[PDB]
């Protein structure tokens, strides 16, 4: 089974490493046939990217004819391209998709998944929400139950800053430190909004796009002497993201640092899952998990 | 596909109800060919149980020839019978098994699963641990990562009592309240840690892999000599135990209160925790229904 890996920053490199650690006999037959970035097309599997050809993901797709596309490229929220048209072409050609790239899903969920459903093509997208902590994939093992609402912390950067602020640290100092660690556009709540959009689509069955979500982020001026979290919320009627003061009896109170959490409420039960929501290995692991599930015929 | 439903107490009745709610198209062709209880064998799927024949689960099995056995019968921790023999006979007949009955798995996991793997038979057992809250099935979507250790709160009754004790209630008063809400009866058997030990045994077997039986678990319960304390069930490659321990405010198990259950799974890559409600007939039946759907998807 031949993969085309689209994107190769830290997540793409971590994925490649996971793949070479031979973690499941389900992946024995899996190779990376090509890697494409801004800088061109490498038609080999190497730790370091050196282009072999000039050209874009469409040229690479035609040349390689992969069985699976793994998209770990940067989210383009303006219009989702080129990943959006890439997924459509992959689906048309019977090529399964594994992705950590939120934009196409947050902009065009119903169109993409309807098209995939019709063609029997599979999409793994665990990596788009809460990295390697089952979220999408948790819902896969909650069959025959209707999700009524979801509430969570879905962004590592802002959780990390809000956690430090609660320890007496300044916004500015906290922001600095988040960046130093590998975490305007970073704190305005948008990332969480895209994530709740995807969850709302998948779990609630509410066909919404990032345009339907009321969100706002964090800043220097938030209330002092209160533990604040950036809460993402969706039910059958509304989808929003906003910073709220949280009380000690709230399950989300001690979800700190880059930890993320999702409270899923169904007809049968309310559950909560929590785990890291940032870190390239974690993101790469969400994609690896999808790849193994795909090989098991379980997406 | 034809099910044989072994047990028709609250879990079985809930299961039959969930099946009839048209919850997934995967269950379109699934019918219950028969229900068996202590009162005999009903060869029909009706809400109200009325036996058509006298006889035990083995007679029903031979008569119906089910594709799947769904075991929601009461756990017999003395020796796991008759469920243990039933599973072996089913496995050897190529009949898949969905179970909420902990006993055979707590006593003879490696024997049962080795046999199933040798025969290519599938076993759904999500319902045995944290009922409807993915636990077993959570691990099914955490592939390619070795589980190093697991820790959890696996028993609602003791957690409820300890939750009250942390808020300043005496052990005696907390137990009374537990008894008032029917969580404990002699409450001796409800608070001795055995239920948690059974569950952690199953989880250790499945997630960590080393053959362990309930006999290998060092477990103790709660009592009036405890001073935020939680009854922690723990397993790694070396050991499996249950004991009351103090938990820090930063610990993800800290607010797992009331009758809630939770499980923390630690791998090389990461630690994750899931929390849910822990016990109830509908919840347990939903664990079995989830297993059935995954079986129909061919994902067990």
UniProtKB/Swiss-Prot annotation, chain B:
Inhibited by cysteine. InterPro entries: Asp/hSer_DH_NAD-bd, HDH_cat, HDH_CS, HDH_short, NAD(P)-bd_dom_sf. Keywords: Amino-acid biosynthesis, Disulfide bond, Metal-binding, Methionine biosynthesis, NAD, NADP, Nucleotide-binding, Oxidoreductase, Sodium, Threonine biosynthesis. The active site is at residue 199. GO terms for molecular function: homoserine dehydrogenase activity; metal ion binding; NADP binding. This is Homoserine dehydrogenase. NADP(+) binds at residues 8, 10-11, 38-39, 73, 100, 102, 182, 185, 280. NADPH binds at residues 8, 11, 38, 73-74, 100, 102, 280. Homodimer. Na(+) binds at residues 129, 133. The gene is hom. Catalyzes the conversion of L-aspartate-beta-semialdehyde (L-Asa) to L-homoserine (L-Hse), the third step in the biosynthesis of threonine and methionine from aspartate. The keyword Zinc does not apply. Optimum pH is 9. One of its GO terms (biological process) is methionine biosynthetic process. Its cofactor is a metal cation. Pfam families: Homoserine_dh, NAD_binding_3. Pathway: Amino-acid biosynthesis; L-methionine biosynthesis via de novo pathway; L-homoserine from L-aspartate: step 3/3; Amino-acid biosynthesis; L-threonine biosynthesis; L-threonine from L-aspartate: step 3/5.
């Amino acid at each position: 089974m031949k993969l085309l890996l689209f994107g190769y920053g830290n997540v793409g490199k971590a994925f490649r490493k996971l793949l070479h650690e031979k973690r499941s006999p389900e992946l024995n037959d899996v190779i990376i046939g090509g890697i494409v970035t801004r800088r061109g097309i490498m038609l080999q599997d190497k730790e370091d990217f050196t282009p072999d050809l000039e050209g874009d993901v469409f040229k690479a797709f035609e040349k390689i004819k992969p069985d699976i596309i793994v998209d770990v490229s940067s989210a383009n929220y303006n219009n989702g391209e080129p990943s959006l048209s890439l997924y459509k072409e992959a689906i048309k050609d019977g090529v399964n998709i594994i992705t950590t790239n939120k934009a196409p899903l947050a902009l065009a969920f119903n169109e993409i998944f309807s098209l995939a459903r019709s063609k029997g093509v599979k999409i793994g997208f665990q990596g788009t929400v809460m990295s390697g902590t089952p979220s999408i994939n948790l819902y896969r093992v909650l069959p025959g139950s209707r999700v009524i609402k979801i509430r969570g912390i879905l962004n590592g950067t802002t959780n990390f800053i809000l956690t430090l602020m609660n320890k007496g640290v300044s916004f500015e100092e906290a922001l600095k430190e988040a960046q130093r660690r590998g975490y305007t556009l970073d704190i305005n709540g948008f990332d969480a909004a895209a994530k709740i959009t995807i969850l709302a689509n998948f779990m609630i069955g509410n066909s919404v796009t990032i345009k339907d979500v009321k969100f706002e982020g964090i800043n220097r001026d938030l209330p002092k002497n209160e533990k604040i979290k950036l809460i993402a919320y969706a039910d059958e009627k509304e989808v929003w993201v906003k910073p709220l003061p949280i009380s000690q009896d709230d399950p989300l109170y001690n979800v700190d640092g880059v930890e993320n959490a999702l409270e899923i409420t169904t007809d049968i039960q309310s559950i909560l899952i929590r785990g890291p929501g940032a870190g390239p290995v974690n993101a790469a692991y969400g994609a690896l998990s999808d790849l193994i599930l795909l090989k098991r015929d379980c997406l």
